[PDB]
From a paper:
One such multienzyme is propionyl-CoA carboxylase (PCC), which catalyzes the carboxylation of propionyl-CoA to form methylmalonyl-CoA, a precursor to the citric acid cycle intermediate succinyl-CoA. Propionyl-CoA carboxylase (PCC) is a multienzyme complex consisting of up to six α-subunits and six β-subunits. The α-subunit of LtPCC contains three domains: a biotin carboxylase (BC) domain, BC-CT mediating (BT) domain, and biotin carboxyl carrier protein (BCCP) domain.
Here, we report three structures of endogenous LtPCC: an α6β6 dodecamer, α5β6 undecamer, and α4β6 decamer. The α5β6 undecamer lacks one α-subunit, and the α4β6 decamer lacks two α-subunits on opposite sides of the LtPCC complex. In our decamer, undecamer, and dodecamer, the conformation of individual subunits is preserved. There are sixteen possible different LtPCC oligomeric isomers represented by seven oligomeric formulae (one isomer for α6β6, α5β6, α1β6 and α0β6, and four for α4β6, α3β6 and α2β6). In other oligomeric isomers, at least one active site cannot participate in catalysis, and so all non-dodecameric PCCs are less catalytically active than the dodecamer.
Author numbering:
A (entry chain H), B (entry chain C): 34 to 522
C (entry chain V): 535 to 665
Amino acid sequence: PTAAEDLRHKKKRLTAMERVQLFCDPGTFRERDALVEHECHNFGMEKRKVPGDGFITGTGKVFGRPVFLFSHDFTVFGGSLSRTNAAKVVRIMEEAAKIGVPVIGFNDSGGARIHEGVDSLAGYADIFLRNTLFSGVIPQISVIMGPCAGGAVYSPAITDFTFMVETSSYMFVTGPEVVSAVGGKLVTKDELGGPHVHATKSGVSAGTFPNDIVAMAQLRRLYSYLPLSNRDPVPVLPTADERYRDVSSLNTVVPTEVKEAYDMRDVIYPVIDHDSFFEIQPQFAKNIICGFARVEGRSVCIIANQPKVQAGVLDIDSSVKGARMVRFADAFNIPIITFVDVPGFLPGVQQEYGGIIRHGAKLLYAYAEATVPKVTIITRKAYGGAYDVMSSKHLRGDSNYAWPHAEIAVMGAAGACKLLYSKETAEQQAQRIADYEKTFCTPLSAARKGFVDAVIDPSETRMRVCEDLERLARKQLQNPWKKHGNIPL
Amino acid sequence: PTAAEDLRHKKKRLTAMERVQLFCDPGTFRERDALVEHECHNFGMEKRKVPGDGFITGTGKVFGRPVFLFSHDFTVFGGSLSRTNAAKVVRIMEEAAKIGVPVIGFNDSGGARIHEGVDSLAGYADIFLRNTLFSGVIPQISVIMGPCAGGAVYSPAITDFTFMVETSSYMFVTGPEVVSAVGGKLVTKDELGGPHVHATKSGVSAGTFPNDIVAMAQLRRLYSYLPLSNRDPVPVLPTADERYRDVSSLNTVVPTEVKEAYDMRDVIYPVIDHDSFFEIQPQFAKNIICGFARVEGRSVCIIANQPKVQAGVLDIDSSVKGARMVRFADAFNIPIITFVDVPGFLPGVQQEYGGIIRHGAKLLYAYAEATVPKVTIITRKAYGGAYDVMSSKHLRGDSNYAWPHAEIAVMGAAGACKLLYSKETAEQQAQRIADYEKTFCTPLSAARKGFVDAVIDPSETRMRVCEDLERLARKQLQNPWKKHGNIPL
Amino acid sequence: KASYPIIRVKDGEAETVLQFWGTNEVTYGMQMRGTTFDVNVMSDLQSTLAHFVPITEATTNTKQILSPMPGVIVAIKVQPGQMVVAGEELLTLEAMKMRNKIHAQADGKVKEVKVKLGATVEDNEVLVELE
Ligand SMILES: O=CCCCC[C@@H]1SC[C@@H]2NC(=O)N[C@@H]21
Ligand SMILES: O=CCCCC[C@@H]1SC[C@@H]2NC(=O)N[C@@H]21
């Protein structure tokens, strides 16, 4: 019996129920509500009632841990929401708020249902309020499998992570018809809101998958990292890997020349456990890396610069990416580990015309507000305000480390030499820049002041990180009483 | 005796002490620390010690209410910060955190002090952490009277409001010398970070003043609105104006044609008390108005659309502006009053390439998260998701009102008629669009559903607003327990 | 009455009625004998310091006027190369279902070529050129 799904598969596409079956465990899905009708009675809609009413909501179970989910249905009315569709979603989110369980939704709606009038707006508003209230209480993940237009786009935005499917998905606020009507330009749906556009240009989508099957397979892996609720502790899984594994290849990663580049992944991979990195937003703002990883069987958060791309310089997009990652990680009590290599901020008129001052402050706010244990490692250099922003010791950092060839200075040697000698005799470059770099572009001064705990061999990083992360397991820090902060938007 | 300030005034500029004297009451300033030296002992700095060390910090008193302030000094070392300058500021902010008092700072620093090494970075980090921790506890206002470059720019950014002086002030992260070095373009300091640029292009500065004297005079007026701390109640001042003043001119403000424009200030001004509006960011994103005002002697927050500019259409910049205003107003228990007139969101490729999805969600998050009393008035129209965003009744709104000629529909009549009749006989425009607009583009349906409390004459708005704002004085609402939210950055 | 227009003042027998327009806390807009003035009310410090304040001069540009935003021109009011006075409407763009009306802020005359009716071009073009 394979009835009524032949029409769907013929278009090389899967069904909502099949997606739900693929996500959860083999036999642990219990559909909650299945016999519900729209009761519209307008515009010749009194007929063609549907039992499911276009939504599939249940409970399920992943890796032995509970979950909640819902999936849109494209065959029935195009997946449009109504006064009645939104009730099921509201009930699921409320139940997942009472119990410490997350929510995952597979969006496929074609837009609002016009035949209901303003009831669709009512349902949208209720879903928006539930998302707003419960953000930071239970993790929310959203996946977009098909078209997603109109005002329905906003609820995925408030969710913590949004993923996209490559061939047959798109998302935008207004359709290309209106764009043609007002501006006069003919742009296709994919050219407007395709997965690539949101992966590279707008920065909304947190990832892209080639197929639905791969999407489910990796969504399970992502779910294996998250904590169940706000009050539950960070999960710890058994692992045969051990902190005594030898990592001596880190002694040679940093080149002896100051103008040559290297890949920061060569430093990230040895420290964490084998094959346990899940990069977030891999194709957007490549000069910074963010993602999840495990250290001795417990999930941690990774944020590191990359001198491979644009000399590892902070920017607007990198600031937004890092700020969102830090805020989410702190909201759910996940340790943060950072690797620092920054020469400063990206210089340019477009930057000031685009508001670098606002955006660069977001990362600093996220780092200063955080109360989870932090570990910082300075590999090569840290200059100016970039050193302050990237989790400096003064921002209530727990432990800070440096490598023997690091440099921590106010600015580059040339600018310091220029400002320290206004009209000093010519040729001052040769006998002053070298001396200043020798005397003050070294971690000795910063260690004398007390800004780094110790200068360590690069081969001891795994040992030190495991020791510190084990000791810091029970830190309790609290901020002054506030209704909420006022972050620079 | 007018010694040592003749050199300053000759350049048509004022001094820090003169600014402090102008701000506070005639004789209520008590300078806190005045005999402090830098104790540097490097690069020939062992000499030329200064008593004040370039900073003036005190307590003062404005309108009989306490304050705290500090002012940079440009004559002494260019206003550079040090390990010692930042200590005074930290002490002032800590004291103003223990006691429920705000802080106001007049920035004039030329950058960091190179002769101290990384101690300047240490001081910057401490100030950044204090700003981050105490934001949302005590209001913070910052004014920029002169140059402000380097990494020192970030602390004004975290503060709630930043104002600028016209002729002799600028702010940016990196100087034009580096821009010339890397990109090769010659741009002046004013062309890069002048007050106009931040007033119109970047949206960082919240206002601009022509002179320092006017700056102080209006800063006092702004201070008269704010509450003293997080736990203190909203100030109420005596006022001879009364809720029984006749406003019948509102019956004629809205034109009888749907395509003609009008000025929303003609609706804003009658409701509030006379000469009591303080616009915030007047020259940026003119399609939305935000500011402070008084209603029956108590300060409230005003957020209204404007069909004069771009048909009152929501956008990226308007969303950011409104979101920041709502967040600040809610953080300190200030009532919010909104006027709604929106046809939707601005359509265009640049918008999606710039991330409309992220930015438009910020206003919705700010409106949904808020717990202060809200009053909403729909004058003419509200369509699509814009109706949901602008404080709809479903987002825990207290009271909502509409005017007799309003319209609340899913979308415009043309699109609804197109979607409701795919290939219906030609000429369907004339006998379908008119009928649909007549039947469903009216507040009767939304009133039937229960989305507006009542349909009122436009002459009763002041009476209704005063009644509701008086009754709602003691509302107590609380959100679920969270360490903090996760707003879409 | 605070923030109101009428102000009745009577010294001895003489009686006067003045009006209060507005203020920016250093300058007061008061009406005397049906005429607007701007009196400055400042203390000793403000008076002694207002001498040392830059007074910049605003741009006095008599040149072409551009349309702030894209749209469509449906109606025009003024004629090409004739007199123009301050506050006169010049034309009306219609965009996203809305007719605006950019006028002439201040000038004596113009020299230019009119943008014809229904020219859906805009994009900050030179609709009218003032010379
Ligand atoms: O020496 C002239 C150009 C030096 C630029 C050095 C890098 S480029 C971006 C960033 N901004 C700076 O001021 N320094 C770094
Ligand atoms: O009828 C064709 C153009 C209608 C646009 C109506 C306004 S323009 C911006 C906003 N987006 C919409 O979909 N409608 C409004």
